[PDB]
Amino acid sequence: IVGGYTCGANTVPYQVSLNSGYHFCGGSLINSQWVVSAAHCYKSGIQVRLGEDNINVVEGNEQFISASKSIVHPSYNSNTLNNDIMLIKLKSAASLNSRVASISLPTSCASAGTQCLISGWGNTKSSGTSYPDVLKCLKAPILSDSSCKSAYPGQITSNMFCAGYLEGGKDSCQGDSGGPVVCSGKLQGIVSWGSGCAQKNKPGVYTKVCNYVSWIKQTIASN
Ligand SMILES: NCc1ccccc1
Ligand SMILES: NCc1ccccc1
Ligand SMILES: [Ca+2]
């Protein structure tokens, strides 16, 4: 997260870190057994880390639980990033309390202009590289479809929305991928792609979770 703020420990209790020997992506806990992340975060051997603030220090509220299975969206296209969503099942249920909690799926799609909360352990620099230890947060509005399309001509599908700041300075970045965009208390987006971080006229692009609720519910009912 570039241009954001320190969230505060366990103030984003649905935020997970995906670890394969190192942090590589975020995710969102949607019930005691399931995480939603980006399909471009897929890999084998995932350990889900819940209850994290500093990802480099064991502070006392963590739960580390291995994934038993991952399910990439059946129509994910890694070229276009259309349908950039994945479900990850935990080998054992998480214990839910104030420091670890699920986030609700949306009922309706979020509105242009709505401020949302984006979070992650990704790079904090637009130019160059610096990774934080503690979870970072960013308040960012959803942009109009027309401004999103103008920023990325020919690339925005109905399964994507833009959020952030056309002037630059404030955005998600590498290592935030797969993490949450929460608007009005519901999971509306997944950190998906863009062109760099915090560059002018290149806002972040987010998977539009409201399009996927049916697939999520059906999948978790059978796996
Ligand atoms: N083919 C998409 C596109 C449209 C206008 C400008 C650039 C790219
Ligand atoms: N600046 C949007 C973005 C997020 C994740 C990875 C690449 C780019
Ligand atoms: Ca920790």
| 127: its two tokens | 């130019």
Full domain range(s) for residue 21: 13-102+211-223
Q: Mention every residue, 6+ apart, whose C-beta is less than 8 A from residue 162.
A: 142, 143, 147, 148, 151, 152, 156, 203, 204, 205, 206
Task: Please tell me whether residues 50 and 75 are part of one structural domain.
Answer: yes
Closest among 40, 48, 58 to 14, alpha carbons compared? 48
User: C-alpha angle with apex 88: 19 to 163, nearest 5 degrees?
Assistant: 80
Resolution in A for the shown PDB structure?
1.1
- Active site (annotated) includes residue 23: no
Instruction: Establish whether residue 173 lines the binding site of ligand 2, counting it when its CB lies within 6 angstroms of any ligand atom.
Output: yes
| 98: its two tokens | 């104030």
Rounded distance between C-alpha atoms, residue 115 and residue 138, angstroms:
10
Task: Please tell me whether residues 7 and 32 are part of one structural domain.
Answer: no
Instruction: Establish whether residue 176 lines the binding site of ligand 2, counting it when its CB lies within 6 angstroms of any ligand atom.
Output: yes
Q: What is the CATH number of the domain that holds 110?
A: 2.40.10.10
Rounded distance between C-alpha atoms, residue 215 and residue 143, angstroms:
25
The count of structural domains within the chain is 2
Between strands 115-120 and 136-141, the pairing is antiparallel
Could you say which DSSP state residue 77 is in?
A: B
User: C-alpha angle with apex 118: 222 to 98, nearest 5 degrees?
Assistant: 65
Cα–chain-centroid distance for residue 111?
A: 18
Task: Please tell me whether residues 118 and 204 are part of one structural domain.
Answer: yes
Amino acid at residue number 128: G
Containing H/E element for 136?
Answer: strand 136-141
Which residues, chain by chain, have CB under 5 Å from ion ligand 3? 52, 54, 59
Question: What values do phi and psi take at 216, rounded to 5?
Answer: -60, -50
